[PDB]
Amino acid sequence: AIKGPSVPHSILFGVGAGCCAYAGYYLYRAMRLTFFDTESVALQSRLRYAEKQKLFHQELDRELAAGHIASLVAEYDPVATRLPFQPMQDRYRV
């Protein structure tokens, strides 16, 4: 199976051919990425830009929701927390 002309030998030959094909693919992509690529850099830059954009929009939406909740501080009445015939607590922001 190691040397002689046989079916195992042919199977080994085909396996070696497949691995050599994939070695060639590795070489192709290595040389391409090392000398023939700007797309990676451009895309990385664009993705960093996208991150900045994402975080901006996030913070903005959070601020708007916070303003919506701040509109309820006018409705908030800390005297209603008072129990009848008891004093008001400074815990509820007199």
Partner 1 sequence: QGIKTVYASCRYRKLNEREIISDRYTWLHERMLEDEVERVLLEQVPAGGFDKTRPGLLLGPST
Partner 2 sequence: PFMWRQRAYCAPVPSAFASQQGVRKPLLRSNSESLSVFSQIPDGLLGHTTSVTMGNSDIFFLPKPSNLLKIALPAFVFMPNLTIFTRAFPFYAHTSA
Partner 3 sequence: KILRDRNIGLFNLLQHHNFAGLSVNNAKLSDSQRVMWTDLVQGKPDVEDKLSVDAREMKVDMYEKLFKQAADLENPCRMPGVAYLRCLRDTLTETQSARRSSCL
Ligand X SMILES: CCCCCCCCCCCCCCCCCC(=O)OC[C@H](COP(=O)([O-])OCC(O)COP(=O)([O-])OC[C@@H](COC(=O)CCCCCCCCCCCCCCCCC)OC(=O)CCCCCCCCCCCCCCCCC)OC(=O)CCCCCCCCCCCCCCCCC
Ligand Y SMILES: CCCCCCCCCCCCO[C@@H]1O[C@H](CO)[C@@H](O[C@H]2O[C@H](CO)[C@@H](O)[C@H](O)[C@H]2O)[C@H](O)[C@H]1O
Q: How far apart are CA 86 and CA 92, in angstroms?
A: 14
Binds partner 1 (CB under 8 A): choice among 35, 47, 68, 77 = 35
**How far is C-alpha 89 from the chain's CA centre?**
47
Helix ranges restricted to H, the chain:
7-35, 39-70
Assess 46 for contact with partner 2 (CB under 8 A).
yes
Question: Per-residue x/- mask for partner 3, residues 37 to 66, rule CB under 8 A?
Answer: --------------------------x--x
Which tokens sit at 42? 């451009």
Binding site for partner 2 (CB under 8 A): 43, 46-47, 50-51, 54, 57-58, 61-62, 64-69, 71
